[model samples]
Target: SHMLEMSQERPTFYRQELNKTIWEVPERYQNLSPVGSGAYGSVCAAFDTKTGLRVAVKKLSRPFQSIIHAKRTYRELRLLKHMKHENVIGLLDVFTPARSLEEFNDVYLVTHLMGADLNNIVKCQKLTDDHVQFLIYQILRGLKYIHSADIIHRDLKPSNLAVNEDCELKILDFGLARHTDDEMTGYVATRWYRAPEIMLNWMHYNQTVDIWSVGCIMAELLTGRTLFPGTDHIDQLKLILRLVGTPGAELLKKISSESARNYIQSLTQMPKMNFANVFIGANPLAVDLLEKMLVLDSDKRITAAQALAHAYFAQYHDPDDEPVADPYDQSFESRDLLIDEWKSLTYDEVISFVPPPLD
Candidate 1:
């Protein structure tokens, strides 16, 4: 109740209801460092004094002024509180509700802070033959679990993924996630991470949208760039066609959507190209997985469950036994190497982050 002293003037607001039980984790956690920011607000890297665990404390940017945003925050808080898994970020504690930071609102959301996101690590890490396969395995495993629970993480980019202290792949950021629609619908997720059907405004798409985003992420891992460098929607379609080869006559026959068909028709006169020829030395297994997931046909897109069963991920699950991991956690050593850098450079150590030269 002492925390209420400062926020006495600020009205307490909850989106729907407040889960005030998260205050027991620890009274204080040292600010070991600062990670980065997200939609919620600035994320500070801190070490929990009580548990000796590292965590990220995401405090609401400001007072939960809007009912909609407040509810979203409370909703995710509830979700993370109960959901426990190795491949998912775990909630640690909760901060008290308050009107603003100036009042020292002790209210904050804390969770096990993992290493740099896959986006940062992939920048310099090389996906060896073994590591690439292992990562895909873990990622698939995580997605399969998500699917089994009837949840659709609308956003599935590499940036939303985290590497644990062991380099294990953990899915992060449920801000943009939503329960799955059995009928398939709506545009969510970032533009580049979106699927073709969603881009065309298909209201009846399925969970396959996630597969498309995963395909793009996996492709970028190997190619080190966006497979489809679309400047805009039209350009995006063109890139998909150019790389996958204009859907061919087979795809043209049953595209379903008129716009999709017309788009394919426009690219019909373009030269045909095959992925194999384009990614000459890339691993065939990885390439094969990409094809199955990236296909223009949602029906043909491999489900995370199905991908979990593939040979490309043989390391995680002893297929002969049962599914072991997802493609995201495939490379143990490589992932660990990435996570091993938790103490590498403190927040102040990053150079580019250094402010510009002053006059």
Candidate 2:
């Protein structure tokens, strides 16, 4: 009751629901309600009186408290700042209540509001082939934008895809994003949507890894089921191979880890299942696209731009749409930073963020 009393001063904040301190938003925004909460922070939906638009403000908590949180905060801010696309989430504004650098523990990000996330939409409504194609096309368009900048959205799942009933979709969350020029890290992405290269702990990877995650996402959208619902790392691999079957000798050689390669060789061979068998009633074109994306070998997987231009999307293809070329520079993914270094880097990001640039 004592703590609750203090929060009454901020009526729109959801202090009790999220169990995290809600910072004071700019007075221009009002009627806030808790819409989403995660490990990093809570998101509140608010109406922007100044702009007459519905917006989501995310309060990133304890940004300087941990190395993990700090790096993620920096990466997300960096990527969101530079990216601009219709299918990508737009960062409208950012603010921190702290007047001085020292008082900054929370970061607030404002973005356009959406009807629902693809995860919810998939479970709630039965989609037709048109909906699936439109949704997937938007996803690819967003991805092409990211990949062109040499950025890989390490996490590419339905939950990260935001959609409106008007048939618009936007990609969100760049917490685990990485640049293609940087050395890849195997330990990222959710287990269910993780790519084979990351799951197998390969020495290096590319944007193709993201295509694999998208493949998994597409499968889930079609069947209303997770393509690989493994309980653990080993089980996840088992589940993937059950459908993808074993890799050929040439692809097996690409596994740089001796243990990972040996372990795979020891397992009994499994026959590959056709997409027709898995996604029973799906359109053949959609199934073909899924098959191209869900390849066991990263090199064999289709690229986002290529997938968009594939025969599956022939009916919906636009001639004005062109693939973005890979020009790798600027942003970086640093996994070698020590704990203290992460904290310091995070501090620099927050302290330097003044007049708050668009992200």
Candidate 3:
């Protein structure tokens, strides 16, 4: 009923006059077609006549529908606008079809269009050892940038990872991401790739959760299926247990949540398996990387940088290649924006997007 009411009213947020100086979307872009849709919004493939580049336009649906939606919208916008990395999705442009705050229900984000996500890659084609190594390398490289900024990409599943036929990869979908210090009790990340710390309610989990996920992704790429095929949260934990085994008694005590600790203790202890046995025929070095990353104890997990430097990727490693911090990065963490402030920032971002200048 609420949606119907808003639709009937044509929500002033969608009908206001856009600037005459620059033509708004669907007009400036040509050959538009819906490519993908999700809980947050639908994405369309469009050719940007202004820039003569093919781009994907994501239209966020009902951005202000609820506090959760509003927060996710802000997170995606802030992270994309500020993050600059080779393996992270680029924010080519952003604009709201709605002219003013009153007409700002939808936000459009323009990004480089890629062939497909990792989900399709693993499912549709056979991957070689080289493919897996390159893909994971790019993920870690992008992650180096994200984690250094003190942000955690809570959701790190295959579909959130975009890849081109060239094997170029980029991380996407930051709607569920947040600062390391933010709340962690609620549901986050795809169940299959979620880390044990989140499952067991460990207090103050950090970037290592991402490492565990990368390990899972590595396994999937090698096997052509999800390493931990899970149905729900508890089921997901069971899947993880079967693969990585139960946490040791010492790590078990670190779970601060009483209910979670009790639940974990009640389950039959699962013995750890050899990484080589799990990933049959995988390069020993790659398997070793997986072992280091997929540790049951979050503290023991190998970090992105460590994974990058591991012998498996020694061929690609160079001491000179490091992620340089963005000078503008300070404002991302320093500013504490209340809801109104966030709304204003979102507003300014949407309107200030200038079409890409000619090459």
Candidate 4:
């Protein structure tokens, strides 16, 4: 057969010597160009012949190197597969060139490519009030879908948000996403955008953590500067307190660490910074929404749903358009699996994948 003849002569894969990565992918994806790289992995932009669209293909670094890395790889794959929202990135395809589980050392994730990330836009262009409102609304809309499934996007920052020329935004990077029921311990999210609850080691945390990040991002968009550019965890709390004011004794008691509670109590009381003065020339409604989102108490902070309903988003908010996702099945996360097991599971997911219709 012609197919058998071609397979015997040459394997259908491209080796990019420049990036030292192999693209053992389907024949339909072509013209790969290195785009970005980070601790997790490297990404390349490619054209999908089948769909006639540009896509970002990510090659996870040392996916099976350790138990933690393997688990994270599995989690990211599962979460991306489970999520399907307009404002959240869609997983268009997944593939591995390995012919068998034994050789499955790399996992490649493919998603629609965006013009740039929010980080780049914020740095280069001054956003208008309308841009900020629409962007914030889309974020909350995506968060509403994620939180509906009982997931907490532990990491929320400008870099994790993808944007295009039309001002459309989509949330990306689910590497640190976790179930709400999971124990809230260890470090999560960037220090500057982290919620006070996580910073103070509060008894528990939930989806509100993401809202705090949105507030931080919103502040940065309004003033063209980071709201809480903390040097470290200690400085992070101090920076937050400086603007939001010192929490009362009752609020301080929520801290799980005795030392943390004591440290906060030791600080002199501070009056909350006036949002109007801080975000000069900003709309009052925008400042009001920021105040609600950046609350010291996680429980009192505005939720994604409530934030969408705020007066700030009244111009763009549409209840019917903002959809929620069904609860995600996270039972797999509880299982203790070895690298081989995770590799096999991820491989199976890749081969059996089917891209959903775009929203």
C-alpha TM-scores of all predictions: 0.70, 0.82, 0.82, 0.90
lDDT of 2 by residue, 151-221 (tens): 87877777788888787999887525322222234432357898878877785888888888888988887
- Rate residue 293 of model 3 by lDDT: 90
Model 1 per-residue lDDT tens digits across residues 275-323? 6876667888777888788787777789988887776776676544322
Candidate 4 local distance difference test against the native: 0.82
**lDDT of candidates 1 onward, in order:** 0.60, 0.74, 0.74, 0.82
Q: Who is ahead in TM-score, 2 or 4? A: 4
In terms of lDDT, the poorest run of 10 residues in model 3 is: 11-20
TM-score of 1: 0.70
Best prediction by TM-score: 4
lDDT digits (tens) for residues 14-73 of candidate 4 = 565438745666777888877744422477788988789998888775777888778787
- Per-model C-alpha RMSD: 14.2, 8.4, 8.8, 5.4
Give the residue spans of candidate 1 off by over 4 A.
1-26, 37-40, 97-107, 175-190, 247-264, 269-272, 318-359
lDDT: worst 10-residue window of model 1: 343-352
For candidate 2, the per-residue lDDT at 158 reads 75
